[PDB]
Each structure stands twice: as structure tokens, then as C-alpha cells.
Amino acid sequence: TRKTYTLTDYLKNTYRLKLYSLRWISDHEYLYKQENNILVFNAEYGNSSVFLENSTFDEFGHSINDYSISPDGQFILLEYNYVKQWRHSYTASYDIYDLNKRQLITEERIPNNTQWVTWSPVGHKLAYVWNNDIYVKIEPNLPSYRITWTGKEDIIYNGITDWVYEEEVFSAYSALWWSPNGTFLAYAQFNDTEVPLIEYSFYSDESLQYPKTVRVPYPKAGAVNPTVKFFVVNTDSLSSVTNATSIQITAPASMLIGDHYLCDVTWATQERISLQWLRRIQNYSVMDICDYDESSGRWNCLVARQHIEMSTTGWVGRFRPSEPHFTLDGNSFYKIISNEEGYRHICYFQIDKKDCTFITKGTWEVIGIEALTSDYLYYISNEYKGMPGGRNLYKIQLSDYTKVTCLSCELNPERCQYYSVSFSKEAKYYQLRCSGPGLPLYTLHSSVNDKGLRVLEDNSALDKMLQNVQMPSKKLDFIILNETKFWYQMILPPHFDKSKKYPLLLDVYAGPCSQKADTVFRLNWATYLASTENIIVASFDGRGSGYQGDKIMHAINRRLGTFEVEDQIEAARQFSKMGFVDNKRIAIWGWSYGGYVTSMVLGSGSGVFKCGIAVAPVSRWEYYDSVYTERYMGLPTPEDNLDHYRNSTVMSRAENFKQVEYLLIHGTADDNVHFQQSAQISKALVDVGVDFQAMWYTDEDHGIASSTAHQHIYTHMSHFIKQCFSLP
């Protein structure tokens, strides 16, 4: 009786998870799409109205992929012809619709194949990138002003990031930043002239007779990196001059001496901007704070306002130096930095004083600063119950740091331990997003008195369905190794019986500053494996994992492929010693960094695992990109860390794979972890006479997320796992 969570359930998404995505358009109103039409909600009372009826664009002749209302509510940007590129980048067509006179603007329209478009933060100015050059339109129906003329495909990028900056630094395609009231438009320019190209075939539809060769500037570890420059243009002067001047802001001398990166851009006030630069050896960063000089029309960054951030134990920041949050007057800012103990906490800075004051502290960390008002700073941390895998919203009194209120901890402690938040424009209201351990719960709250206004989405519908299925349970706990505690989670089959021996699958990622043991509720492949196949799926956060202090996170500095790999093997030993695991049936699998660790574990000769699956794995660090790799590994040169680069490859352990069953999978169009990486693993295995299973996914990328391939790969992996555990 009562069905279980099956593979088909997962692949067909029969049990749908509901969410509540809103867009604040002011300090007390937000937009919500309720069945193809845009509604506007009054936060205060919960009442609404139709902002844009679903029939507004039926004869548009195109499927609108997304929309964007200008800050002043006067226009709406319609995106269509969406064509995905990398992780964040894509191109599209755009039309502007005048919401007042209800008409679609047909003159001086945004070009087709536009790479990026953004409204000014105030009013309705527009800035967009086309053919790698920046353009600005003061009015939707007027001609654009071209800002740059150097744009050149795969070579010069104005206003948009190149491959590595998009993926590893800004996690965005856009590289432009409007000043608060929209007067200035700041942007970065990347030059990839000497950056080597990764080349791979793209087969496309069957009708393409000759395969296409995709070529993208991609700097592998130790190769020539793109160089970068920063500029600011006064958009208010565009209609007064024929060719507005882009004033350059040069990097400090400490960065110019060698290769470096621009890693953060954050406006402070209408005439003050801050920039952080990072040396290619990512343990030294500098923040400049630059002011507009109204008499010279130039930007100057006083050395008395420069802030240095460096690390003696690792790289700076979790993945990059943190962003500052300036007070209204721009004279001070809050920033998350690692304290003397190695834990990331909020530090209060005066712009012209080098010593900051920490406003939080403890053996836990601040995840992020969410909002700042004249009286309070709101942040998310894992302080609650000392659970590094939990997240809660807190409020600290700027006039009395001992006054810290946890705003989400006790709301529903059993159902909610992992929160995310979304504040209105002036932080007058905030939407809380609970994502576990129970079903996601979305709520709205008033900042003036921190009172709950109402439940936005409680997922009652799904709760109703799941009651008729034997769902698995999840356990989150820790084990103590060398005096330090390390967390793990287990997806346990229904009616779990600890007096039995269950087969165990270790689900691993384990890249630096990652966390696989948390309180988030997920419906994924492990759900089906535990529920239907009675398999225990475990994950462990060992050395190198984040949110637990630098002692743990920086333990793998300059040594990827060691401690995080070993700790995974040790975790499996610990789990077997728990008594309910069948030592004859322990498997391991991972994707991406997880594919690498899995492969390293399978080739360790530990004898602990019977089989494993690596999906799109890194196989040798010299094949991965510079920014990410070098951050942890330094440079692959004899004078630096070449020996470890050469000693941490999967290929060097090929012989040991004779002891296990291995399934290797990779998408041929992977622009991130090149197919090359798995090509070298398979070749090494063939060379030592090792048999193994393999699967390539034609034209799929690092995500192997196309609908058909997603279903195909998880189906293939399920058969392999079931076979290895002989269920069947």
C-alpha cells in the first residue's frame, strides 16, 4: 500500500514544488505572475490588481521569454528570441511597450542579438550591449548613443564579461553598473587578444552536414589571462556632446606590477564608487574608493581611502573578496571579512581609516548582508543552534551591537531552518523563504514591527499528495575527527531499520567552500534511490568545506585532490562502522568537482567502494580555467606548485581502477569542464587495460540539462547503480 517516490516521479516531476517569486517595484508593492498575467500586490494589505493582462501580447507574433518594468513604471521591456550561451550569458530580441499609452514602440528599437540590457536604477534610461559595444538610450523611442567603438567578437568585451569572468568572478554576463540616480554608467572592458581558445565540435541537428567547431577564449591554469580596464561615462552629457568621454579609473600600483583581476564594483553614492582588485595570486586584494571631481570631470581614488585585504592561510574571500554595503552618506561601509579566528564576520569600516571594527563574532559565520537602514543591518548566518548547515535572518542595532534579534529562528523551528530573504525597495517589508527541512514556506513580514503579515505559499497542495507516498527521511548530524566536528546528512529509506544492512551511495561534490550537508528539502534522484530502491544516500563535508571557518576551508590550500578526497573515504569507513551499512555495497558518485573527487576516490585503492559514477569530471587541474584553479592551486610552474598539479591527476591512478566498476559520463559540448578531461581519463584507462562503462551526451554541456538528456542520464545511472548493488 502507498506508492513510493519512483524514478518516473522524479523525471516527470509529478510531485511539483510550489514557490512564490515576487518582484518588488517599490517599497510596498510587488509584481506576481498568476497564470500568464502580471499582478501588482500591496504588501501592507495583501490586496492586488491586474498590472498586465495575459492577453496583452497575443498578437505580438512572438513568445515573450521574460519582461522587465522600468523603475518608474512607465515602460516594460519585452524579451524574446532568447538564445542561451554559457551559464549566465544569452542573446535576445527586445521590444519596449509604453504602459501609459498602451502601445508597442516601433521606432529606434533595440537591435536583434542584443547581449545585455538594463534599465537605469531610476526613471527609464536604457543601456545595452550589442556586438560587444555599449549603447545608451535616454528615451525608449529615441536614437541610442554609442559609448564604445572597440568591441570585437572574442577579443574586446565592453560592458559584458568574457567566459572566465562570467563563470568565476561576476557570475553574470553584464559588466556595467549604473550609479544610484543613473547619472553615471560605469563599465569594465576585457581584452582577450592573447587568451588561448578551447575548440570542440558541435554537431547540431542531423541536417548539418559538417560539424561546427566552437571556439572560445578560455584561459586554462597558467595560461595568458584576459586583461581588464575600468571606465565611467556621464550619461547626462550624451545629448550635449557628440562623443561623451569615458573616464578611465586605473588599477592601483600594487596590482599593475603583475597579472590581476577586477573582482568587485560597488557604487557608494551619486559621486563615489568603490572597486576591488585581486592579484593573479589570489591572496591579496585592494579596494579603491573613488570620487568624482566636478572641476576636472575625472575620478580620483585617495590612497587614504584604499583598503587592503589579504590572507596568510589561503585565498581572499569564499570565492572572491566580499562586497561592501555603504551607509547612505557613503562615509562608512560594512563588509564580511575573516576575523583573527578565521571566521567570517561583519566588519564596520570608516572610508578613510584602515582599521575596522567587527560587529559580530563567534564560532559560526555570516553568510551575507541583506539590507542596511539608518538604524539596522540585516544579515543571514548559520549561528542558530551551531548548525553550519542552517541559515537564519538576523537584525543588529547599529547604535547598540549587543542588540541582535534573530528574525526567523523561532517562526517554525521544526519545519524551517534554512531561510533566504527579499526586502522591499527601502526594506519596509521582507519576504522570507524557508526551504527546509520541511516543505518550502513563503511568508511576508512588516519591517516596522517585525510582524508576520501573511503566508504567501505553504505548499499544502504538495503536502497533501506526499501523504500518499512512502517518502524517505533525512538525517543531519556530525562525527568528530581530530577534535573537530564534521557534518554529514543521510537520505534514509522509509521505515528505516537500523538492525539491517542497507547498501550506501556517497553523493559527493566537496569543492572548496562547498556544503553538501544542510537542512534544505529536496526532491531529487536520491529521493527515488532511498524511497524506491531502499538505498541510503549520504553526503559529507570534510576539509575544504565552507561556512565553518578558515581552519577547515583553507585546509586544502595549494593541495586540491588530497584532504577532501581522503576525508570522503574516511567518511565511508565511519558510516560502515555505524552498523546499518552493507560494506559489500558502498558506491560513490559526483558531478563536476564531485566527478573529480569520485574519480580520485575510485582510484585511491582504498578497497572501500565497489563502484562509482563520475559526471563531467575535472581530471587534471591544468585543464581547468585559471581564475578558479589558481585560486586554490597557485600557478602550475616549477617555482610555484607544478609538482602538486602533476601529482593530483585522475590519470595517474588508472591502474587502481582495476579494483572497481566505473561509469564515466560527459557532454561533448561542455564549455566549462572540457570533454578533453574525460577523453584523457578514458585513454589512461584503455592504456592500462582497465574495463569501464562510458557515456557521452552529444551537444550537451556541463549541465546535461536538456529534458531528454536529463532523463536519459539519470535512467542510465539508475541501471548502473542497481546493477552494482544487484537489486535489481
Ligand X SMILES: *[C@H]1O[C@H](CO)[C@@H](O[C@@H]2O[C@H](CO)[C@@H](O)[C@H](O)[C@H]2NC(C)=O)[C@H](O)[C@H]1NC(C)=O
Ligand Y SMILES: *[C@@H]1O[C@H](CO)[C@@H](O[C@@H]2O[C@H](CO)[C@@H](O)[C@H](O)[C@H]2NC(C)=O)[C@H](O)[C@H]1NC(C)=O
Ligand Z SMILES: C[C@@H]1C(=O)NCCCN1C(=O)C[C@H](N)Cc1cc(F)c(F)cc1F
Ligand U SMILES: *[C@@H]1O[C@H](CO)[C@@H](O[C@H]2O[C@H](CO)[C@@H](O)[C@H](O)[C@H]2NC(C)=O)[C@H](O)[C@H]1NC(C)=O
Contacts of 60 (CB under 8 A, 6+ apart): 78, 80, 95, 104
DSSP 594-612: HHHHHHHHHTS--S--SEE
Please report whether residue 28 would count as binding ligand NAG according to CB under 6 A: no
Beta strands of 2-101 (E only): which ranges? Answer: 3-4, 23-24, 29-33, 38-42, 48-52, 66-69, 75-84, 90-98
Q: Is 307 in the active site?
A: no
Please report whether residue 511 would count as binding ligand Z according to CB under 6 A: yes
What is the smallest separation between the CB atom of 162 and ligand U, expressed in angstroms? 12
Please report whether residue 473 would count as binding ligand Y according to CB under 6 A: no
Candidates 592, 604, 619, 626; catalytic one = 592
Give contact residues for ligand X (rule: CB under 6 A). Answer: 109, 111-112
Q: Interacting stretch for ligand Z, rule CB under 6 A, among 102-110, 167-175, 241-249, 538-546?
A: 167-175
Cα 280 to the center of its chain, rounded Å: 21
Which does residue 203 touch among its own copies, ligand Y, ligand X, none (CB within 5 to 8 A, set by kind)? its own copies
Cβ proximity to ligand Y: between 65 and 191 the closer is: 191
Please report whether residue 620 would count as binding its own copies according to CB under 8 A: yes
Q: Is 266 helix (H, G, I), strand (E, B) or coil?
A: strand
Cβ proximity to ligand X: between 112 and 363 the closer is: 112
Q: Is 300 helix (H, G, I), strand (E, B) or coil?
A: strand
Residues of span 627-646 touching ligand Z by CB under 6 A: 628
Which H helix or E strand runs over 626? helix 626-633
Please report whether residue 309 would count as binding ligand Z according to CB under 6 A: no
Cβ atoms < 10 Å from Cβ of 528? 24
Which amino acid appears at position 672 of this protein?
N
Q: Is 526 helix (H, G, I), strand (E, B) or coil?
A: helix
What is the smallest separation between the CB atom of 152 and ligand Y, expressed in angstroms? 8
Cβ proximity to ligand Z: between 140 and 317 the closer is: 317
**Integer angstrom CA distances of residue 532 from 313, 493, 529, 563, 663:** 45, 8, 6, 33, 22
Torsion over CA: 55, 57, 61, 67 (sign): negative
Q: Which of 381, 380, 375, 379 is nearest to 397 (CA)?
A: 375
Q: Show the DSSP H helices in 349-400 as ranges.
A: none
Starting at the edge strand found earlier in the chain, the sheet holding 366-372 runs 366-372, 376-381, 392-397, 400-406
What is the smallest separation between the CB atom of 229 and ligand U, expressed in angstroms? 7
Q: Report the chain's terminal Cα–Cα distance, integer Å.
A: 21
Cβ proximity to ligand U: between 171 and 248 the closer is: 248
What is the smallest separation between the CB atom of 109 and ligand NAG, expressed in angstroms? 4
Please report whether residue 672 would count as binding ligand Z according to CB under 6 A: yes
CB contact at 8 A, 569 and 561 = no
One of 176, 301, 601, 618 touching ligand Z (CB under 6 A): 618
Cβ proximity to ligand NAG: between 457 and 566 the closer is: 566
Residues of span 99-138 touching ligand NAG by CB under 6 A: 109, 111-112
Q: Which of 245, 351, 268 is nearest to 304 (CA)?
A: 351
Report, in angstroms and rounded to the nearest whole number, the Rg of the chain calculated over CA atoms: 26
Residues of span 163-182 touching ligand Y by CB under 6 A: 181
- Using CA atoms, how far apart are residues 438 and 416, in angstroms rounded to an integer? 6
Candidates 625, 670, 671, 701; catalytic one = 670
Residues of span 262-301 touching ligand NAG by CB under 6 A: 281, 283
Residue nearest to ligand X (CB): 112
Which H helix or E strand runs over 188? strand 184-191
Give contact residues for ligand U (rule: CB under 6 A). Answer: 40, 42, 45, 47-49, 150, 156, 191, 193-194
- Using CA atoms, how far apart are residues 690 and 695, in angstroms rounded to an integer? 16
Which does residue 709 touch among ligand Y, its own copies, ligand NAG, none (CB within 5 to 8 A, set by kind)? its own copies
- Using CA atoms, how far apart are residues 128 and 146, in angstroms rounded to an integer? 10
DSSP 214-265: EEEE--BTTSPPPEEEEEEEEGGGTTTSSS---EE-PPPHHHHTS-EEEEEE
What is the smallest separation between the CB atom of 582 and ligand Y, expressed in angstroms? 44
Contact pattern from residue 280 through residue 319 relative to ligand Y, giving x for each residue in contact according to CB under 6 A and a dash for the rest: -x-xx-------x-x---------------xxx-------
Q: Interacting stretch for ligand NAG, rule CB under 6 A, among 30-38, 370-378, 468-476, 521-529?
A: 30-38
Contact pattern from residue 314 through residue 333 relative to ligand Z, giving x for each residue in contact according to CB under 6 A and a dash for the rest: -----x--------------
Which does residue 197 touch among ligand Z, its own copies, ligand X, none (CB within 5 to 8 A, set by kind)? its own copies
Please report whether residue 38 would count as binding ligand Y according to CB under 6 A: no
CB contact at 8 A, 21 and 5 = no
Contacts of 182 (CB under 8 A, 6+ apart): 120, 121, 122, 123, 125, 235
Q: Show the DSSP H helices in 125-218 as ranges.
A: 163-164
Residues of span 571-600 touching ligand Z by CB under 6 A: 592-593
Q: Is 670 in the active site?
A: yes
Residues of span 219-248 touching ligand NAG by CB under 6 A: 243
Peptide bond into 728 cis (omega under 30): yes
What is the smallest separation between the CB atom of 629 and ligand NAG, expressed in angstroms? 14
Please report whether residue 203 would count as binding ligand NAG according to CB under 6 A: no
Q: Is 497 in the active site?
A: no
One of 39, 122, 155, 223 touching its own copies (CB under 8 A): 223
The C-alpha cell at 272 is 563615489
Cα 489 to the center of its chain, rounded Å: 22
Which does residue 511 touch among ligand Y, ligand Z, ligand U, none (CB within 5 to 8 A, set by kind)? ligand Z
One of 87, 125, 137, 220 touching its own copies (CB under 8 A): 220
Please report whether residue 57 would count as binding its own copies according to CB under 8 A: no
One of 28, 361, 712, 722 touching its own copies (CB under 8 A): 712
List 77's β-bridge partners, or say none: 68, 96
Please report whether residue 702 would count as binding ligand Z according to CB under 6 A: yes
The C-alpha cell at 415 is 519545519
Cβ proximity to ligand U: between 46 and 386 the closer is: 46
One of 84, 171, 698, 727 touching its own copies (CB under 8 A): 698
Going by their DSSP bridges, the two strands 484-492 and 536-540 should be labelled as antiparallel
Q: Among all residues, which ones are annotated catalytic? A: 592, 670, 702
Residues in touch with ligand Z (CB under 6 A): 167-168, 171, 319, 511, 592-593, 618, 628, 672-673, 702
Residues in touch with ligand NAG (CB under 6 A): 35-37, 53-54, 93, 109, 111-112, 149, 243, 281, 283, 310, 312, 481-482, 484, 634
Residues in touch with its own copies (CB under 8 A): 196-201, 203, 206, 209-211, 213, 220, 222-223, 620, 622-623, 649, 651, 668, 674-676, 679-680, 682-684, 686-687, 689, 691, 693-699, 708-709, 711-712, 715-716, 719
Residues in touch with ligand Y (CB under 6 A): 40, 42, 45, 47-49, 149-150, 156, 181, 183, 191, 193-194, 234, 236, 243, 270-271, 281, 283-284, 292, 294, 310-312, 634, 640
